[PDB]
Structure 1
Amino acid sequence: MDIILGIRVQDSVILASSKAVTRGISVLKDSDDKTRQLSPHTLMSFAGEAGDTVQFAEYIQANIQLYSIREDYELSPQAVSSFVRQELAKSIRSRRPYQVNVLIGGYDKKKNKPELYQIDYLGTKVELPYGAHGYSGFYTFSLLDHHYRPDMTTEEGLDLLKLCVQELEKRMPMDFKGVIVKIVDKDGIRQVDDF
């Protein structure tokens, strides 16, 4: 797990998420997609405790897919985030809480706006132009504080992300084996296949 970022630009939300899965002194995998698609225009990235992350992600995904079928309608990113926050906020007071942090990037087809949500395992939710979970933020927030602008094109967004990932590759102590980048816009979700 470890590195997950998101940037909302003018027209889309972009999630970058590290590829390594490390356990002990071995990198067991270097091509791990730390993401689920909850609905056609809503994507969630996740990082945290082994097992908990995927179990939580898929549980949410199935719940959202069940909603989509029943109502023949796509929930707004705002509503999915609010559902997810509540789930996590229940979980924190369970016998065993999920230890999972999530970023929810969605495109609201009713407002035609991209939306990015940061939610931690406690059920703390915040809408942001750009987010990060874990140690990543300690580097990327200041860099984005500087270079980010609200009207950027998806193109400008990706370059701004390259900058982040480079700084992380320079100063992070661990090898996170690069990121998988995805774009959520008016036409759904697609994955940049060369980063």
Structure 2
Amino acid sequence: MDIILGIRVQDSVILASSKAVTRGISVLKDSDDKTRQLSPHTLMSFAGEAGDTVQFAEYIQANIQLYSIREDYELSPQAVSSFVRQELAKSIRSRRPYQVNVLIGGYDKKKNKPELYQIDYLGTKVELPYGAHGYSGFYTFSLLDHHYRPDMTTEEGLDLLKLCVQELEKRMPMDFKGVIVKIVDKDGIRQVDDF
């Protein structure tokens, strides 16, 4: 799919993902949720080739849920991101690689810290205060570089995110039909239903 953004503020991680699903000529859907809850305090957004994106995301979800049941324990965001990276690094030298880029937003309950990980389809992982995939970063990073502070509130993060989306809507040729925004914090994952 197209635009996926992430921003780590003081006490939460915010993931914004576009709603459009376009199959060549027509926009087939304008309410698509490009995300999966891997565990109660870990969310993964995704974008890439059709079919592979959801297939990969659900495969990861199943594996993390399996771990959660086996050990009666939630893996840290760092541990989950390392598992995901290895799967993609394994995938890139396969017969047919997963063409999927992901952002992993999680709240580490042990350290009481939000964490954002950016991983591309090659298995290139980086921990960031804010991140994106595709062309999204080209339009938004100059705004994030300017306004971002590590001590921002969730409300300030959402306001900076709105400015990013407005810039995308202005200068991007494609109509991505707005974004679904989700917040990951100590209380878990919730969706901002008005954005």
Q: What TM-score comes out, normalization by structure 1 length?
A: 1.00
| 1:160 maps onto 2:168 in alignment | no
What SS does the aligned partner of 1:102 have? strand
Shift, 1:167, TM fit: 0.2
CA RMSD of aligned residues (A): 0.3
Q: What does the per-residue CA deviation read over 1:132-182, in whole Å, with 9 as the maximum and x for residues that have no partner?
A: 000000011111000111100000000000000000000000000000000
What SS does the aligned partner of 1:123 have? coil
* C-alpha distance in structure 2 between counterparts of 1:50 and 1:91, whole Å: 16
Shift, 1:69, TM fit: 0.1
* C-alpha distance in structure 2 between counterparts of 1:24 and 1:58, whole Å: 24
Among all aligned residue pairs of Structure 1 and Structure 2, give the percentage whose two residues are the same amino acid.
100
* C-alpha distance in structure 2 between counterparts of 1:6 and 1:135, whole Å: 14
* C-alpha distance in structure 1 between counterparts of 2:147 and 2:2, whole Å: 23
* C-alpha distance in structure 2 between counterparts of 1:140 and 1:99, whole Å: 23
* C-alpha distance in structure 2 between counterparts of 1:172 and 1:117, whole Å: 25
What SS does the aligned partner of 1:84 have? helix
* C-alpha distance in structure 2 between counterparts of 1:179 and 1:20, whole Å: 9
Shift, 1:60, TM fit: 0.1
* C-alpha distance in structure 2 between counterparts of 1:157 and 1:57, whole Å: 26
Q: What does the per-residue CA deviation read over 1:23-79, in whole Å, with 9 as the maximum and x for residues that have no partner?
A: 111000000000000000000000000000000000000000000000000000000
* C-alpha distance in structure 2 between counterparts of 1:66 and 1:141, whole Å: 36
| 1:178 maps onto 2:178 in alignment | yes
Q: What does the per-residue CA deviation read over 1:90-134, in whole Å, with 9 as the maximum and x for residues that have no partner?
A: 000000000000000000000000000000000000000000000
Unaligned runs of 5+ in 2: none
* C-alpha distance in structure 2 between counterparts of 1:96 and 1:136, whole Å: 26
Shift, 1:19, TM fit: 0.1
Q: Deviation above 4 Å: which 4+ runs of structure 1?
A: none
Aligned pairs for 1:68-83 within 5 A: 68-83=68-83
What SS does the aligned partner of 1:134 have? coil
The answer for the alignment partner of 1:16 in structure 2 is 16
* C-alpha distance in structure 2 between counterparts of 1:180 and 1:9, whole Å: 18
* C-alpha distance in structure 2 between counterparts of 1:76 and 1:24, whole Å: 39
Unaligned runs of 5+ in 1: none
